[PDB]
Design a protein around this ligand. Sequence first.
Ligand SMILES: [K+]
Ligand SMILES: [Mg+2]
Ligand SMILES: [Mg+2]
Ligand SMILES: [Mg+2]
Ligand SMILES: [Mg+2]
Ligand SMILES: [Mg+2]
Ligand SMILES: [Mg+2]
Ligand SMILES: [Mg+2]
Ligand SMILES: [Mg+2]
Ligand SMILES: [Mg+2]
Ligand SMILES: [Zn+2]
Lengths: 174, 38, 99, 177, 100, 162, 40, 161
Amino acid sequence: HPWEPGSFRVGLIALKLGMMPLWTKDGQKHVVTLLQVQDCHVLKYTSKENCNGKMATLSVGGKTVSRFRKATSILEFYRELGLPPKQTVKIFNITDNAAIKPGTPLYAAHFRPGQYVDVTAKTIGKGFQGVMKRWGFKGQPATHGQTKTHRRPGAVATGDIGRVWPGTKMPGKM
Amino acid sequence: FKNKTVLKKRCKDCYLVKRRGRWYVYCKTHPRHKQRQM
Amino acid sequence: VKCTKARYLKKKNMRTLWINRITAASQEHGLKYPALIGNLVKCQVELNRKVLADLAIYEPKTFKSLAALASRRRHEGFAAALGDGKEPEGIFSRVVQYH
Amino acid sequence: SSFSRAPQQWATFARIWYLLDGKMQPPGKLAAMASIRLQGLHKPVYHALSDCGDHVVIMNTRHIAFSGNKWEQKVYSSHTGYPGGFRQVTAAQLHLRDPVAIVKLAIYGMLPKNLHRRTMMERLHLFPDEYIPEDILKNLVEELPQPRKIPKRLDEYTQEEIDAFPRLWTPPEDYRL
Amino acid sequence: TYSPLPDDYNCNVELALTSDGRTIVCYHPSVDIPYEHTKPIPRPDHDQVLKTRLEEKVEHLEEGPMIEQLSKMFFTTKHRWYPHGRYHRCRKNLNPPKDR
Amino acid sequence: FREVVETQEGKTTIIEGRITATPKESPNPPNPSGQCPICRWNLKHKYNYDDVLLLSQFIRPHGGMLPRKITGLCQEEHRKIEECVKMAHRAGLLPNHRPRLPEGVVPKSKPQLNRYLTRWAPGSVKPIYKKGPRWNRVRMPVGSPLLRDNVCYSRTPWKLYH
Amino acid sequence: AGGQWRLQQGLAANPSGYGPLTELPDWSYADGRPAPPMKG
Amino acid sequence: SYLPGYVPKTSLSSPPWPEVVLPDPVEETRHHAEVVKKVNEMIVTGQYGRLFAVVHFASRQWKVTSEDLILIGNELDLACGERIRLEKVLLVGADNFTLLGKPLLGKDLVRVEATVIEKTESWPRIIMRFRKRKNFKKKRIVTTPQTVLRINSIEIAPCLL
RNA sequence: ACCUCGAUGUUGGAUCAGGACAUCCCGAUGGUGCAGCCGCUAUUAAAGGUUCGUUUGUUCAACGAUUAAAGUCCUACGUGAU
Ligand SMILES: [K+]
Ligand SMILES: [Mg+2]
Ligand SMILES: [Mg+2]
Ligand SMILES: [Mg+2]
Ligand SMILES: [Mg+2]
Ligand SMILES: [Mg+2]
Ligand SMILES: [Mg+2]
Ligand SMILES: [Mg+2]
Ligand SMILES: [Mg+2]
Ligand SMILES: [Mg+2]
Ligand SMILES: [Zn+2]
């Protein structure tokens, strides 16, 4: 179908290579991230009626992995599709005029220069971290009598409530 | 608009009107006569 | 201690349960609980809540007859209230006197 | 009834699906009649320890009618638990966001405050429009009468009733109106 | 034509009084469902070589999905479907008295 | 009634007043001794907002209330009818007396909210965020206080505040 | 229930007070011999 | 064509409940005799099965039928096996007919007989009272006497007319 | 002087703050002895913000330089098994 206003097309699943500087004709040094799209294909299509949602959902995979490290249910899904299994599978909300046949590969040419895009991925996990590194609390001075309190949250609530509000910033996995 | 518990016209041009649940005093001749029921 | 004090609650709770069951069956016949108990007294039918609850469960046809009697007696009172006593009392409104 | 012991017990403690039409009806009166059916209060064999409740299906929950200024004055408030999570929405705001929330909250506040209350809400079915799923529609039994009788609009009166009602005054012939 | 209650659903109640007025007679014969108010029962419900042997269709389901399926078909909550400990399973009377 | 029509031909405007058919009061009133048409027909304390047949006889084609000196009603019943007319439009029982829309105006689609017994105008009502204690509850008005003396066939009187 | 109506009929507000329901003996022998009077 | 008491039909002009017209007492009086005679004719021919009777015994109303048991919380001073008659019957009902006493049925219309089959004491009942911080504590155990009666037969006689 | 005399010393600060609106700033809107900028006053608004220092145990305050502003309070005069 031709392009229409209010239509959403599918995206890609890229791999973050690294960073590289880039200069413009204005002389400003802009740093960009090299996203490599490799073995990106459309897995299945779900219509708006079957989606139970406003938009139609489309399945996309990337980064072909080994067939020996997947469950039986996932492997048999790719057996009929005739594609190697994908590591990360994302679901994109599209419109009826943007449907793509399953098994269709996708390339970096899907995007063009001057187009603004949105990148989604898991952040770098820092494990269990204290409030000072997780929420940026100031802490306590290292000297002037301080006793075993330099990186502690301090007060967490008031005495009247006699409880801690949900969502209170406490040490945990970041 | 000056909030008054008791609304009193300040001249012959002031007129009462019931709008948005509370009485108002409008006066085009004297804009300072406008009042809102508190 | 709870055993001794629960003997009053058991008697109280049984009667409350009976009233709900009597009310449930009266609504199936288009009547309210005050309209049934109140009008059965005026017919000298002295049936307690225990019997009426049992009748409403095991004798549905008998309960409907009582509902019809209470409804008929209820209608007789309204007719008597419209008149000034000139008309005779209702057929079911007669009271058997005991000396 | 000369039934066998098991069929007789099953029939008495069976579940009956009822239908309610909520168009131009107050939510509370709909909830009052839905409360007794859900708890089983309409049965003479009712008891709290016996799960004798029935299924209530309410249709046209989007077209309920609120008496007075309850669309603007009544407020449905809830708290998410987080600081600053105290939300207060009016009946009109809640109705547009969720057409079935008003009826659901009225019924939920009438059931006894016990563990059985959440079980009774599972046997309550709400549908904003007149469309009903076949499985729910194929097992209905009785349509309970609407509590409030909808008054007739001026255009719904036939000429027989309009002409039957007498005019009380004679307007002057020179009145512009 | 007066009738205190409609004689349509349960029985035909006929109130009466005795000559002395000391006894109320209630003749209530049972009503029968008319033949025109009932529906007929739904009695109704190739080149095959291999007989269709019975195939087991007991699909394995986790504790979660199993309870969710049960809570929807019986229109109950998930709480009642979880098991109980030995302490409660031992307090239950396995030989309760029976009436009627 | 009387109607006014303006016809312009040859850039000249002519205004004329033409008399039309006027309805006549029904003969043999039940109570000729009444002073106003309400008690003349024993309709005092016996009508509500939903009786659009009675209310339509005291309103203009655009829904406006008629003057008291024209209809001949008393001061007490005119206010009661005036409030019933207001609640009739708000309840959607008068679809043929809508306000006149000037040319070139198309009303926007607005939330169709069913309501009745609405004392106040919907746009002038603020939500009750703080209900208050039990002894100082902020009740929601239902109906109209001017109908407090209407004939009630139930033992419980009309509840004008919820 | 019905206490006010009974008092207007010359009876007791409580049906257990006096009358045929209470004063009469509650049982009698099958042969027809009268029962001994109850304690109440 | 309007009477002085005429009111045009409105919401509150007429009572919400529909008007009810009671039957003519003269016409209904003979209609009652027809129903009573039919019900009386069902008793001579024995066109009834099991009968349930509501009797007033030990200040209690029992919905009893034939061959059933009732527990009475007092002693009747009667040897076990003795057959007695329950004089007070308030209601006798069948599958098709029901008779109501006002408030009691005549002795010539219904006869209910029971049998004393077991006289025993109740299980020990705990009566304990306790008040905190007052050293008030006393326990009492009582065994109220009990009596079990079995309803043998419930027969009626054709005396309605 | 009602609760606590069979283990909370209090104040202030640090830490992290939740909340009220009787609003210091940002927003909207009447009046003005509102030309325009500045101002004053009133209604509405608590989504967001509300500085760093010298002497002083300081809270506060003084003045030092700023800021669109350096709000009034409550919370066991918040928080001391931090
Ligand atoms: K301590
Ligand atoms: Mg890591
Ligand atoms: Mg530091
Ligand atoms: Mg130390
Ligand atoms: Mg240290
Ligand atoms: Mg009692
Ligand atoms: Mg304010
Ligand atoms: Mg402190
Ligand atoms: Mg401190
Ligand atoms: Mg502490
Ligand atoms: Zn003025």
